[PDB]
UniProtKB/Swiss-Prot annotation, chains A, B:
Residues bound to ATP: K12, L13, S14, G15, G55, R59, T162, Y168, D171
Organism of this sequence: Xanthomonas campestris pv. campestris (strain ATCC 33913 / DSM 3586 / NCPPB 528 / LMG 568 / P 25)
NCBIfam families assigned: pyrH_bact (TIGR02075)
Role, per record: Catalyzes the reversible phosphorylation of UMP to UDP.
The protein, known as: Uridylate kinase
Pathway: Pyrimidine metabolism; CTP biosynthesis via de novo pathway; UDP from UMP (UMPK route): step 1/1
Quaternary structure and interacting proteins, as annotated: Homohexamer.
Subcellular location per the Swiss-Prot or TrEMBL entry: Cytoplasm
This enzyme's EC code(s): 2.7.4.22
Swiss-Prot/TrEMBL catalytic activity: UMP + ATP = UDP + ADP
Activity regulation: Inhibited by UTP.
One of the GO biological process terms: UDP biosynthetic process
Recorded GO CC terms: cytosol
Membrane recorded as keyword: no
UniProtKB/Swiss-Prot annotation, chains D, E:
Cited HAMAP family: PyrH_B
Entry protein name: Uridylate kinase
Location (main, coarse): cytoplasm
EC number of this enzyme: 2.7.4.22
Subunit architecture: Homohexamer.
Residues holding ATP: K10, L11, S12, G13, G53, R57, T160, Y166, D169
Length: 240, 240, 237, 238, 238, 243
């Protein structure tokens, strides 16, 4: 047996999640903190895939300008995720972890291209899979790419780490009586206009019935606990 | 002043030149002024190639970690260099300029691979060439990529834009009687222990008989004056 | 003059099939190519996206005990064949054609490059896109919407069996009425079917004007370009 | 135990259609998967090549006023679609497979690299080659011959409608007999049609042993591996 | 005026060596460059294929008994070096040239793409093809034929050591008879050697006109373009 | 072979000029020379060394027709890079003939012909006991074979770059012109630059200096020398360290 309720998982973060208290880039304490959480999880036996957005890098008036071409912007954003994946990889490897970064667009000798069968193979070998450049196409979000990769690797759980720990009744940072759901249907999310991922991202996850755990990673040990089946955050799953 | 003293030029800038007063990224007003200067040069009949570093993006304790794997850092810098090239391409195109971004490492639909023959014909067609990612090799400096590309395109002049306007025999910011050199031999630079460019890049430039102008972009029209033979900053040329 | 300068038209692929139960019907593709040249010759810039349902067919090819990803690839592959067929058909009529693909294949089809695709269009070349998005779990609709956004299309046209968007069920109901035009939010409220959720959000977010219609008689496309009201027009916040 | 260590089995595309007239008949492909898995289970390192005629069919696709490079390109893709189908059939029965294409198509299958292909066979993986030679104007048989030679196969098997090479048409002239064994030169002199000229020249120049046979009844493959004289064996210099 | 508008000229690599034992003789390669540019200026669209035997030679390189895939790869690489030298010589004389290879090699030589190749030819550039077919076990002649057919050449010219196809060795026998014209079928019937079997079949199945000839003296290539009957013409049926 | 206890260098890169392969001939590869070299490399590996190889292209890119005095240097560097791929292929073949596992990795992509260089993959081949053969230098014109060798050595974490030359080591003065000339056992990177000693071209030497790559300049004068160096023998000249 395994001691995990979930064996193969894709954990998705914002690029800012790396930023800590700074205004750009990566806080080393934070990334190192996160590397430890991740290695703890795989050591418990979990097969771990990581997806990290690029908003800590592709940001500011000059880079993420409203007057920049959108495709141009999305490419810059993709390139940013590659840069974050490289940093995550290094932080992990310094801890003795085995890591493979795969991008949705080919970049020679900096990382490997995503090949579904190979990704799976790295995972079945206990390597951490880090996915960059999302879908490889502009006009698609990091969530889209996370969802795509979770389905392709046959992940049992997509975890999306957010500022808010769960999908609430109604935005807690503006309402102190907001009630977080323990679990929800894909259809109940739509029915009530809850915001969870962008439309396209959510439709993709919904179409394969990807179990979707929304939560806040604002405390050490939270991941392992979730892998041991802890009902932390909100589980989105199933029809209605 | 119609006729050019220099017909095909390669201009090299640090990434932090794009940053302006900020502490990361790109200041849209700075990149606009840069674009304006480049177009001015091109409209006077110069064939212009650009190389811009990545230090405005690959920065901070978490990205340019003081103890990270060097290959990983260099790869990160290379990707930063592509992000800057895309933003340079955008600013130029908004001004009516024709531009082609070529990279030492190919990345589909974001930048073509460098091909010497195609680069040269882009210039003959009046297109501005932007080179990203250096030599494509870690352990090589942006200066090295600049010298290599200059030689490969047969540039008549390699220009390195620095904060300080030329090479000083002291250092004009923290010293009263600093003296600027007008023109120096490659050998005079070394003999006088002057710090102009890393040993490998400097040697490449030297062996290829490439005139090198170190200068500050201190006011509008400097580039154009240099193209008309003006003696701004310092010329490194010849030997002994 | 022209109501739409640059358009992308997406076909299902069985649209190539004709009365046949398989592959392609030569007479129905010549007619198809005839309409396309007509529109370009009228000064329009044309991009084509065709599905692979005519080739990716049957219990053996399209099964359900099949790895979805590999079925998706078989579909992409099958869109590249159709593209080559159309390309051949258009070129025999002296039209200039460039097939570009989400997945690159040497000396069969070009890789997709936004700036290059557009410069082909501007040069009067017909652009055929294959393999959609390049990702499994994504429809031909998504692929078409993406490319049309990428090339700054003025209109995405989507040929279907049924001309226009339903009020009821054109095929057993009798009294039905096609909406002339619609809003993206009107389609979403009334729960009408236009494209799949993902493709449709992608279109909306870029306010891609989309015309759902049926190509029956020779001229329909050309008329639409001169401005008409054939089928349904989905647009606006 | 094995009369052949490493084999390449070549099938035409229509072998897949079965009773239908395009695509793949699921029953017919399944039977094939089983025979292949039996061969590999017996200790044989197996490679396969399947043509595209079952998919690149019809007056619309495989025309005759068409560009030849185009139609060859259409056939090449069709061989990849067949390879993918065969791949999933083999995997649904517990086999390790690797699809390798003469033309690069990322994320759908591997590029053919000879050294890698061999490395695969010796892991017990079955190799499936698509897109033939990668070049137009070359036959599926040429692709099969070239790959059989590159991997150092002991046997190229070619499954066909007729269970061997005959002195005459056995569907039109009973009394026609099957050769048990011909040399390459025997074939050339008797004007016997086996493979197209180029493909046969390729095989002859490397003395590739050739088995022409039919796969009508189950166990043929295993029988051949143990040493049965099924079909016609072509090899040697006259 | 012009009897052939699009041609492919095939040479062996030794043709660039001159009297040397290896590599390239600069005087010899400069004469061939003129000879090529002369054709181009006459209005001919000219493609070139040059073998590698001037480079891939000696017991160390062309090791009679080394892995054949390996030595064919070493051969393909040699053709690329020659292509680069031919290109340099040609451009030095003011010509526009494009080297295309069956094997992609970045910033050295383009991927071969049929439509692009014709377009280059249409714009007045000389097309140099290297690396043959891209497959081991195929000859330089095979790659020449495939290329000539892919680009729609009206003539494939094979420069060889004797000026045509002969009854017997003309260097030992002043008695020898040269054939002006031969059919593809006569060549096979009389057992004359023109190209290897696979290459010959490839050219025959597209009825590619072949001119086997000696580049003995300057101007021969222009003359041929104007209808001169030099060496031997192979064409046609029965 | 020998015990892993005796290894003074675990991962090495050996660099040779292409002409080291020609032997007596004025072109290409002398079968006797290349077979000898494979034996030296196999013996190094059997002693537990992880061996990487870099051979230049001057045995093939030579003569007035190829290495033309007045020719475009870029196209001549390209021709030279292709020549190194050819030499690597021959080396692969000789080595595999003697039962070694080999991988050829090129700085320039050439599909089917050889693998593209990728650092992580190269390290993995080495730790799997395979010989790594690097071809095509840094992948860029205007860079010496020594530069490609230094870069590769640093990328794979070599404990030693060995550079085989005609002269076995670095001398205080030209030996053939100074019966007095003496051969340094070891030098610092700074002593080299200070005395104007010639070890590599400037760019290659700065790459190696900046990573402090240990450099052993030596002559492969008689068989067994490589293996002796691997067990700590003081042969040729060690360049390492600072000040």
């Amino acid at each position: 047996m395994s001691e995990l309720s979930y064996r193969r998982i894709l954990l998705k973060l914002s690029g800012e999640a790396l930023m800590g208290d700074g205004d750009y880039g990566i806080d080393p304490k934070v990334i190192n903190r996160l590397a430890h959480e991740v290695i703890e999880a795989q050591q418990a036996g979990a097969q771990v895939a990581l997806v990290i957005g690029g908003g800590n890098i592709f940001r500011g008036a000059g880079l993420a300008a409203s007057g920049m071409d959108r495709v141009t912007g999305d490419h810059m954003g993709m390139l940013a995720t590659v840069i974050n994946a490289l940093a995550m990889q290094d932080a992990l490897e310094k801890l003795g972890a085995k890591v493979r970064v795969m991008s949705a667009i080919k970049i020679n000798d900096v990382c490997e291209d995503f090949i579904r069968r190979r990704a799976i193979r790295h995972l079945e070998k206990g390597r951490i899979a880090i996915f960059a450049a999302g879908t490889g196409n502009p006009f698609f979000t990091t969530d889209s790419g996370a969802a795509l990769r979770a389905i392709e690797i046959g992940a049992d759980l997509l975890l999306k780490a957010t500022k808010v720990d769960g999908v609430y009744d109604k935005d807690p940072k503006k309402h102190s009586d907001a009630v977080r759901y323990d679990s929800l249907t894909y259809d109940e999310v739509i029915m009530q206009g809850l915001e969870v991922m962008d439309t396209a991202a959510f439709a993709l996850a919904r179409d394969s019935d990807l179990p979707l755990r929304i939560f806040g990673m604002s405390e050490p040990g939270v991941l392992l606990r979730i892998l041991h089946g802890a009902q932390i955050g909100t589980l989105v799953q199933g029809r209605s």
